[PDB]
């Protein structure tokens, strides 16, 4: 009944939009946020939180090397990348690294809640 989200996006004002979103539902409730890859994976190692979004294109580490540190620590985390136009040419990294599904920025709130309540039914 409750989906313990973290959002990890290296832009505030995306981060800020999904939070807005998911505000709206009881269900995701964001437990934590992180700017690059390399905060994703310690968070995440705290948190446990039961999903992630995960954008891709991010400095210093980036999404698709979070998602393979933690998909190899705490494999039952599903990780859904946070993708758009300009990332597409890492689309295939992240299908390689394990990523449960997508979202897609610009958001459109329906279409992240079908895409999150399909893993969490
Ligand atoms: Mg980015």
Redesign the pocket.
Known sequence: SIVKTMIV???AFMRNILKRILSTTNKYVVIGEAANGADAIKMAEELQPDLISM????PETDGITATKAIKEKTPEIKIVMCTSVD?EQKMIDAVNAGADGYIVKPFQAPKILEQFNKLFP
């Open positions: 996006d290296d832009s954008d891709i294109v991010m990332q």
